[PDB]
């Protein structure tokens, strides 16, 4: 059996909530967020990775469009191909498209591989979050209720399983039997519960949270 509840923040594996601003870079924050946790597990150091590095450098070859959107999976592939990603401190976020300024001097992580989970499987998603770490996912965030969410287990009747906003599942649990995913957003600390949103779990792939999950790994060799 899996634990009833997990919260990778309690294991020191989750950096501060970031603020994407007017740049549609949530895919980039989702990607680095998943990698930050694998890095902490392997090295003992928690260090924000450079979302801007991805925006500026993980571009056309990876099907990504900088501030106009992208994919976590090909973000990971870029880090594999590039043999590194800079720290956020060395390559901080500017919420706009820029020229690629990747520098191997300031590499703070690598990526060995990534794994994609099957569409809609919230049981498989739960197992990965428990056994692997935070999982990059897309959600359907095209709803005023999403922007307006303040607290509780978010359930939107009109939500769809088509995803358009990258976020990071850092855990799961229940509140009085209402099951939820613990989701790290990139809209700063003032959104939701200190930048997090708890989203309805085991409710028919609500908002497409398990439509396109994936997580990276950093192996010993």
- Residues near ligand BC7 (CB under 6 A), total: 20
Q: At what angle do helices 26-43 and 72-82 cross, to 10 degrees?
A: 50
82's enclosing H/E stretch is helix 72-82
183 is written with which tokens?
């989701």
Does residue 75 touch ligand BC7 according to CB under 6 A? no
- Between 68 and 190, CB nearer to ligand BC7: 68
Nearer to ligand BC7, 11 or 65 (CB): 65
Q: Is 212 in the site for ligand BC7 (CB under 6 A)?
A: yes
DSSP sequence for 132-150: T--EEEEE---SHHHHH--
Window 111 to 150, contacts with ligand BC7 (CB under 6 A): 138
Q: Give min distance, CB of 3 to ligand BC7, in A.
A: 26
Which residues have CB under 8 Å from 2's CB, separation 6+?
126, 127, 130, 131
**Contacting ligand BC7 (CB under 6 A), which of 40, 54, 211, 216?**
211
Interacting residues with ligand BC7 between 41 and 70 (CB under 6 A): 62-63, 65, 68-70
| 30 near ligand BC7, rule: CB under 6 A | yes
- CB 34 within 8 Å of CB 218: no
Rounded to whole angstroms, the Cα distance separating 47 from 40 reads: 8
138 vs 171, which CB is nearer to ligand BC7?
138
Give the Cα separation of 70 and 59 in Å (integer).
8
Residue 200 CB partners (closer than 8 Å, separation 6+): 153, 154, 155, 178, 179, 180, 181, 206, 207
Among 8, 27, 93, 154, which residue interacts with ligand BC7 (rule: CB under 6 A)? 27
| x/- track of binding to ligand BC7 for residues 148-187 (CB under 6 A) | --------------xxxxx---------------------
Give me the least distance between CB of 177 and ligand BC7, in Å please: 29
- Rounded to whole angstroms, how far apart are CA atoms 131 and 118? 16
Location of structure tokens 């009085």: 176
Nearer to ligand BC7 (CB atom), residue 62 or residue 180: 62
**Chain residues that interact with ligand BC7, rule: CB under 6 A:** 26-27, 30, 62-63, 65, 68-72, 74, 138, 162-166, 211-212
């Amino acid at each position: 059996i899996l634990p009833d509840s997990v919260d990778w923040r309690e294991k020191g594996c989750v950096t501060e909530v970031k603020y994407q601003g007017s740049c549609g870079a949530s895919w980039a924050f989702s990607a680095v967020g998943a990698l930050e946790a694998q890095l902490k597990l392997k090295t003992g150091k928690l260090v924000s990775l450079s979302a801007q590095n991805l925006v500026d450098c993980s571009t056309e070859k990876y099907g990504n469009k900088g501030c106009n959107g992208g994919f976590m999976t090909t973000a990971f592939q870029y880090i594999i191909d590039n043999k590194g990603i800079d720290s956020d401190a060395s390559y901080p976020y500017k919420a706009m498209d820029q020229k690629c300024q990747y520098d191997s001097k300031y590499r703070a992580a690598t990526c060995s591989k990534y794994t994609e989970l099957p569409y809609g499987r919230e049981d498989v998603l739960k197992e990965a979050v428990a056994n692997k770490g935070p999982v990059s996912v897309g959600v359907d965030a095209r709803h005023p209720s999403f922007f307006l969410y303040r607290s509780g287990v978010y359930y939107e009747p009109s939500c769809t399983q088509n995803v358009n906003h990258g976020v990071l599942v850092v855990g799961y649990g229940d509140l009085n039997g209402k099951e939820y995913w613990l989701v790290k957003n990139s809209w700063g600390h003032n959104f939701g519960e200190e930048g997090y949103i708890r989203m309805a779990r085991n409710k028919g792939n609500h908002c497409g949270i398990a439509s396109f999950p994936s997580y990276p790994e950093i192996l010993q060799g």
